[PDB]
Design a protein around this nucleic acid. Structure first.
Ligand SMILES: [K+]
Ligand SMILES: [Mg+2]
Ligand SMILES: [Mg+2]
Ligand SMILES: [Mg+2]
Ligand SMILES: [Mg+2]
Lengths: 173, 94, 139, 201, 50
RNA sequence: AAUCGUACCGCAAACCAACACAGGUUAGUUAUUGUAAAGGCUGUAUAAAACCAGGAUAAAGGAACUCGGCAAAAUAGGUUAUGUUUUCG
């Protein structure tokens, strides 16, 4: 997991002042969206993983307030458009964990540790991620437990337009 | 690089690579590149680049230490990783 | 003979392309003519020296004719007067370049802004079509 | 081409203080139906800005400025909003957006504000009476209403005469001098030819 | 104040103070030239070139 | 109308200081109301010791500190009826 520090927010210092620290992280976050896979040092990767997850959350919101916050983070219009349209629909049902991190040894010159950061559901993914919604066996204790604790458990992906919206449109037309 | 070069030498002589032991290793002084670096108040110091020779000898059935290292597989990435097929329904039972 | 040279390699002038004498990195006013990649020995030599940044309205300038009329009669004052006139002429060459560089920057910014607007329009139009398909598919 | 908010009660304004999106679904649906259903919100509304974000803002300011020039007395922001919409149609949605436009005009001396008089600073801070705004027919170099501008000019005129003669008395030039810098190059000559072609067309 | 900057090069000064024309203008300068010819120095004055 | 200078560095890693030296180095020009056009430049990998340096904030007291208000802090600016001292400014 990502370590928590004593500074406001618990973020890394990345050996930089706060002003340069924020400029660097915003640029890298923009490149992660564009390319979906980046190789860098362990500290910048750990900070980028936690920052990247919270940037996807804004895209899933799809609100005017969320877009204003993201417009101050992303550096390119094309990358910002992709975040709200393509990635928003991709992770509708996935609850967290949109980015993964795998260590890749040490560099050559300064022998610094490195890692790879990637998105967790796409073509070209390093591994195959678990389904966003976990299937539940019909005759398992798990099914009974979820009924008693969370009657609104989601077992299969839902359509883009739910039945209530479809029914309203049919009645209207 | 020296270890690989020495083993290739042993095979040409007709020795079994599976029984080789590192029996002798030592270093030797080379030719140095001399230089100077200025200091404060007009003083001067030395600035030397060093060089060394390396010698490795491999022999068969020589006295060897018992040290052995455990080996593990690296991270599984690609179609060979099947962590996504885990069934998590069992842990809800008693 | 013409008064000003009109055939310049503008890739060389802006700096994207190398010149005919790569050893020279910042040509002088009288060195521009022979550093031009399009130099030809058949073209007549201009009667005056101008940089590529000069406007076409400079062909009617006659600076030494006016200087003679303003010439002081005291040699001591005349020498200083001539020195200030030469300083004025040399500076005029680098006023043109500064205007040349500022003028082009504004045109570039306008064009770049226009392209940015068009790209966003296409992206938004494409998304709207996709949104319409989703509703139509769901009936 | 103004667009309505999901409540279908007003138009969204192009500024950072707008917290409501634009409804863009092909069919009209109440907010309560689709907001709590769980479907992605981007299928119903556009939270982003238009490609002409900057140009639209400049156009709105001109409409506000022209309307004030037609007025004969200072008026409130609410009156400005109603007057502009009645003249041109439903193009502005809130008074906060108009206030932001007015602040830009005040900074550059394209408009002025009439403020009340209060006995103590605390009363002024706690007052809630709306403000009144006017417009200058041409841009000025002093702040305040025409009466205040005339007073400021009188003080400025006196200072200039005081400075000019003090310089003369101390053996300085009464009026500062500079050199004329040539700002007309080959790029400018081509811009003029382009401008004539556009005007002719 | 920082010291060590006693040399401020000047081409006109160097020729006038130590030039060949200066060394040949006085009896003592001519003797200096002979001393340098006797020792066999390849360059006689700072002013010399081919 | 002949003859000599024209490349490159020039507040600098190329000149004076033994150095790619926090020092020294002349003149001419340019954008900018509360700002600032052109042009130019760019840092091995981390962090939640003591200690040291350069900043920030601080309850109640306010020179009790110390050879000494050293250092730090502090409404600092403008106009005044009246009074004092002057070599009358
Ligand atoms: K979040
Ligand atoms: Mg020294
Ligand atoms: Mg040159
Ligand atoms: Mg205190
Ligand atoms: Mg005391």
């Amino acid at each position: 997991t990502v370590k928590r520090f004593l500074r406001p927010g618990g973020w890394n210092r990345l050996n930089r002042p706060v002003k340069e620290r924020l400029a660097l992280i915003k640029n890298m976050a923009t490149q992660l969206v564009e390319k979906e896979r980046i190789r860098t040092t362990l500290s910048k990767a750990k900070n980028l993983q936690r920052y990247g997850d919270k940037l996807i959350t804004l895209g899933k919101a799809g609100t005017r307030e969320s877009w204003l916050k993201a417009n101050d983070i992303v550096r390119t219009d094309r990358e910002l458009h992709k975040l709200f349209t393509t990635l928003a629909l991709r992770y509708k049902d996935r609850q967290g964990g949109y980015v993964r991190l795998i260590r890749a040894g040490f560099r050559r010159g300064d022998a610094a540790p490195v890692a790879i950061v990637e998105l967790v559901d796409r073509e070209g993914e390093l591994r195959q991620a678990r389904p966003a919604v976990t299937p539940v066996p019909k005759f398992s204790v798990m099914r009974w437990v979820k009924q008693q604790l969370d009657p609104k458990f989601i077992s299969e992906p839902a359509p883009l337009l739910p039945p209530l919206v479809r029914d309203y449109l049919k009645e209207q037309n | 690089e020296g270890l690989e070069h020495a083993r290739k030498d042993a095979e040409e002589k007709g020795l079994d690579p599976k029984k080789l032991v590192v029996s002798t290793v030592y270093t030797a002084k080379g030719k140095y590149l001399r230089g100077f670096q200025p200091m404060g108040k007009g003083f001067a110091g030395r600035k030397t680049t060093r060089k060394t020779h390396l010698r490795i000898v491999l022999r068969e059935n020589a006295s060897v230490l018992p040290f052995a290292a455990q080996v593990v597989s690296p991270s599984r990435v690609g179609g060979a990783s099947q962590k996504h097929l885990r069934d998590i329904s069992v842990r809800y039972t008693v | 003979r013409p008064i000003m040279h009109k055939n310049w390699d503008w890739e060389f002038v802006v700096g994207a392309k190398a010149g005919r004498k790569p050893a020279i990195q910042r040509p002088k006013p009288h060195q521009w003519y022979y550093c031009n990649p399009k130099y030809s020995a058949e073209d007549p030599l201009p009667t005056k020296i101008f940089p590529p940044h000069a406007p076409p309205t400079a062909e009617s300038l006659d600076d030494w004719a006016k200087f003679r009329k303003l010439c002081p009669k005291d040699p001591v004052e005349a020498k200083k007067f001539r020195k200030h006139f030469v300083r004025f002429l040399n500076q005029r060459n680098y006023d043109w370049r500064t205007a040349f560089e500022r003028g082009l920057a504004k045109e570039v910014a306008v064009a770049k802004a226009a392209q940015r607007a068009e790209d966003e329009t296409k992206r938004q139009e494409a998304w709207h079509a996709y949104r319409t398909a989703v509703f139509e598919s769901a009936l | 081409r103004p667009a309505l908010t999901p409540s279908f009660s007003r138009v969204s304004d192009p500024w950072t203080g707008e917290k409501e999106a634009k409804y863009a679904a092909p069919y009209r649906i109440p907010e309560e139906v689709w907001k709590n259903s769980g479907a992605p919100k981007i299928l119903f509304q556009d939270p982003w800005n238009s490609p002409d974000y900057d140009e639209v803002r400049k156009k709105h300011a001109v409409l506000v400025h022209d309307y004030l020039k037609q007025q004969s007395q200072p008026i409130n922001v609410q009156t400005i909003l109603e007057g502009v919409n009645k003249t041109h149609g439903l193009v502005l949605g809130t008074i906060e957006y108009v206030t932001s436009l007015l602040e830009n005009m005040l900074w550059h001396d394209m408009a002025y504000v009439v403020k009340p008089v209060f006995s103590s600073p605390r009363k002024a801070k706690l007052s809630k009476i709306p403000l009144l705004y006017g417009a200058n027919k041409y841009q000025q170099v002093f702040r305040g209403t025409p009466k205040e501008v005339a007073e400021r000019y009188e003080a400025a005129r006196a200072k200039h005469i005081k400075v000019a003669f003090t310089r003369l008395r101390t053996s300085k030039t009464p009026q500062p001098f500079r050199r004329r810098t040539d700002e007309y190059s080959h790029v400018q000559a081509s811009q003029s030819a382009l401008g004539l072609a556009a005007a002719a067309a | 104040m920082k010291r060590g900057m006693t040399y401020q090069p000047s081409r006109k000064k160097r020729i006038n103070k130590h030039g060949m024309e200066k060394r040949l203008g006085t009896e003592d300068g001519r003797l200096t030239i002979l001393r340098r010819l006797e020792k066999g120095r390849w360059r006689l004055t700072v002013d010399m070139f081919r």
